[PDB]
Ligand SMILES: CCOC(=O)[C@@H]1CN2C(=O)CCN2C12CCCC2
Ligand SMILES: CCOC(=O)[C@@H]1CN2C(=O)CCN2C12CCCC2
Ligand SMILES: [Zn+2]
Ligand SMILES: [Zn+2]
């Protein structure tokens with residue numbers, strides 16, 4: 001059995017479990033069950049499953065070097081799939097809510113969930129709530145007797161909290177911190193003093209890296225009962241690095257990828273987002289380039305968005321990117337090396353994560 | 361130490377813990393810490409604390425009849441307060457998100473959180489996410505070594521899931537089930553075939569009763585290590601009953617309480633809500649009264665909302681209410697009686713919940 005085909009089979013099994021429990025215990029009717037089914041499929045399916053498959057891949061890694069009965073291999077893979085799905089659905093929660101928060105139009109070349117005609121924001125906000133509740137329903141049902149249950153549940157919450165904290169950092173990133181105040185409508189930054197590497201890094205680490213890289217790697221370790229075969233500080237550091245690289249690619253794509261090939265129309269310029277382009281561009285601009293940037297950033301007006309793009313194009317940020325790229329290729333390989341001291345297997349699983357991030 | 365003054369002290373201690381952990385582990389800056397502090401106070405404080413205080417009251421009940429060292433009494437009360445706060449903050453999550461979902465204007469005579477000038481919906485949706493994450497942060501920190509930790513965590517999730525399911529039932533209550541479909545914009549019901557006692561009951565049970573009545577009673581039991589001194593099926597049934605009564609009062613208040621004395625301007629008529637008034641009114645209307653109701657329900661137009669009110673006024677629903685009241689006074693007292701077989705203390709704690717619901 002190919003890993004993907006296992007993963008996907010477990011989706012069906014998990015879906016059937018959740019909906020049948022809704023009928024037997026939560027008094028649901030068939031039409032509401034269908035609604036929730038369509039919501040689950042529309043919001044959890046259709047991506048690459050990079051996060052969920054990472055849990056499966058790390059588990060498979062350890063299977064190849066650890067003695068187990070066949071039924072134990074099966075059990076561990078079924079746990080890897082279930083934990084995988086917890087993370088996918090946790091992402092779906094965040095994608096649903098974030099698309100509402102930001103007033104987004106599309107993702108994966110289809111409309112945001114809230115924009116479906118029969119959904120609306122009133123239902124979608126609560127649909128996103130349910131998606132994350134399902135992660136806990138999954139975990140208590142399938143992992144009830146597992147020795148890893150508490151470590152797994154405790155890890156998952158802290159990543160979830162961290163992500164919501166990252167979300168806060170992100171949607172506040174175009175404000176001046178010293179002006180934050182619930183009483184007072186928040187003006188956009190005029191000095192851009194807080195568009196720095198360290199501030200950028202903080203947004204990305206909390207908003208993305210913990211849920212996309214750390215969570216899947218460490219869940220792989222928990223369901224395999226293999227946490228003591230890695231140095232957890234290394235796992236965190238390599239996760240940070242790959243996570244940050246991932247986002248920098250995703251920031252360069254918002255600006256320069258055709259909207260058709262991005263699965264969405266990019267708005268980072270017009271949302272005044274603390275992207276890697278703006279931070280890096282402000283790291284090398286002259287006075288006059290900075291003044292022009294400020295007059296044109298965070299304006300929905302397309303003439304001005306052409307101006308920020310022209311400034312970025314003229315700025316030669318590709319050279320800054322290859323240099324960042326090179327250093328990250330450097331640093332990840334050092335971390336992989338350090339990871340081979342304890343688990344060669346694990347370090348290989350990190351290498352595979354790194355390749356799939358480094359290409360796309 | 362009065363119970364309230366204990367509860368409130370623990371709020372300060374919990375708040376300080378959460379914000380200091382944000383600084384030491386989540387890299388937060390002082391202005392974002394202040395923002396979150398103001399958000400916590402504005403969204404968790406200002407009510408009666410009926411739910412949180414119930415956990416404290418049930419625990420105190422058992423203290424009076426169980427032998428413990430003084431430090432154990434203290435510990436149990438501090439757990440009751442912490443668990444209490446988990447429920448208050450879980451409510452705050454739901455109130456924040458629901459006010460956004462429904463486009464509400466006020467609660468407790470102050471603006472909804474999303475409407476504060478420095479917040480906005482983009483931040484408030486994620487603020488509500490954080491509120492519920494804090495419940496889990498609280499629980500893992502304060503209850504890490506507690507024998508009740510897993511039962512507590514497992515109960516809390518299922519109530520949370522149940523509530524979000526109740527929310528779905530509620531916002532879909534004015535639709536025809538057989539028409540639900542994410543692809544198709546949902547028309548309001550024309551026949552009102554689904555405004556029945558049983559359908560009403562389902563909305564209320566999931567949306568309110570589990571989080572308002574069941575959760576606090578059973579959390580009281582868990583932190584007191586007293587679950588085997590009650591018959592859990594009785595606890596559930598008495599919770600259902602009081603929960604439903606609570607909502608019926610809250611449905612009569614939406615229509616007939618001055619907006620000043622409700623802490624909000626009522627919209628159940630105009631939202632086409634499955635209230636106890638509409639269900640009960642449709643349980644005794646003649647053909648002509650039903651036709652008029654249908655022409656006037658779910659329309660923001662005030663002339664028509666005067667017409668639904670005039671129909672309800674003429675319908676003599678007060679008589680239907682005293683009869684429902686009487687039966688519930690009947691049935692709760694039977695359940696209290698059955699609850700005295702095992703725990704007299706517990707049954708008294710349920711009696712107190714019942715009095716505070718039955719007055720206000
Ligand atoms: C496996 C160990 O991981 C951690 O300790 C991270 C690093 N730290 C933070 O920056 C916020 C709290 N904590 C985390 C808890 C889980 C995700 C965030
Ligand atoms: C203490 C036992 O309580 C239950 O079994 C209820 C009753 N039942 C439902 O209707 C949905 C699932 N389950 C609950 C789980 C917790 C809240 C909802
Ligand atoms: Zn966003
Ligand atoms: Zn992007």
Ligand SMILES: [Zn+2]
Nearest residue numbers: 458459461462
């Ligand atoms: Zn609502």
Ligand SMILES: [Zn+2]
Nearest residue numbers: 610611614628
């Ligand atoms: Zn109401």
